[PDB]
Ligand binder design. Structure first.
Ligand SMILES: [Zn+2]
Length: 259
DNA sequence: TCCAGTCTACC
DNA sequence: AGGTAGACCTGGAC
């Protein structure tokens, strides 16, 4: 999932687990990194006081420590209310249940197991995976002035820089492809060759694209302008969308509307 | 057959 | 260092 889906996941679990208290934790497997056995002993009786998100990580907080959950490329987190009989029917990819004092179940699912469930004891801001991340794309800190300045010593394709978590978090393959198209910029443009006006447009397109996706999250449908539309018509010029490989990632764009 | 986040590793 | 590729693993689309 990318940042819209993680933010929508966050907004879905929080009203369902925050005030509540953990009673058991089921571990049908133990991902990219190993899970901690006796996580149930760790969390039993501990109230949730907050959930949160940083980059594509979810954060479940207690007074004793922080649970970090990453969905990777195919992970899901879902709530089952006590009356929901799907509690009794987990599939082979439903690796973890987090069961609350009231019967509510939070279920983590992840077929390829690229996600992570990690338990951490110290200061949130110092976690090794969160410490060196760049700014939030929907924060004031991700501005045209920062971006133009961060990009001056980078010769690399701007798509690489825009997908770099040290430059800005959360802009994955889909929304980097869509923002670069909507801003009119080739993904192959050297990052330091974006003009200041172009970095201001790319910034506001990222913010707009990501925000609309957070709210959105037989008949003709088309979510995307270029992503996953190899060899189909560009919605602006009608020309064919090309797909290339840039930084090991599928890169879709129109060479006519993007320079 | 090949397509679909990020930590590690080498020149 | 910056730039590259490999590593993880499983399901579904031509
Ligand atoms: Zn076009």
């Amino acid at each position: 999932p990318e940042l819209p889906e993680v933010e929508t996941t966050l907004r879905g679990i929080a009203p369902h687990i925050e005030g509540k208290t953990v009673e058991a934790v089921v571990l049908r497997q133990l991902l990219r990194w190993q899970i901690n056995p006796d996580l149930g002993e760790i969390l039993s009786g501990r109230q949730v006081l907050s959930c949160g998100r940083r980059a594509k990580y979810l954060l479940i907080r207690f007074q004793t420590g922080v649970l970090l959950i990453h969905l990777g490329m195919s992970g899901s987190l879902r709530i089952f209310t006590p009356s929901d009989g799907r509690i009794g029917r987990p599939d082979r990819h439903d690796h973890v249940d987090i069961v609350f004092s009231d019967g509510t179940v939070m279920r983590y699912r992840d077929p390829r197991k690229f996600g992570a469930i990690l338990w951490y004891e110290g200061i949130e801001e110092h976690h090794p995976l969160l410490e060196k991340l760049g700014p939030e794309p929907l924060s004031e800190a991700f501005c045209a002035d920062y971006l133009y300045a961060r990009l001056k010593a980078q010769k690399r394709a701007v798509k690489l820089a825009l997908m770099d978590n040290a430059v800005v978090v959360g802009v994955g393959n889909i929304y980097a492809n869509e923002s670069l198209f909507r801003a009119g910029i080739s993904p192959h443009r050297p990052a330091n060759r974006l003009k200041k006006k172009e970095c201001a447009l790319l910034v506001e397109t990222v913010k707009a694209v990501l925000q609309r996706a957070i709210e959105t999250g037989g008949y003709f449908q088309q979510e995307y302008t270029v992503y996953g539309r190899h060899n189909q018509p560009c919605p602006r010029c009608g020309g064919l969308v090309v797909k290339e490989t840039l930084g090991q990632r599928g890169t879709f764009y129109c060479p006519n509307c993007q320079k």
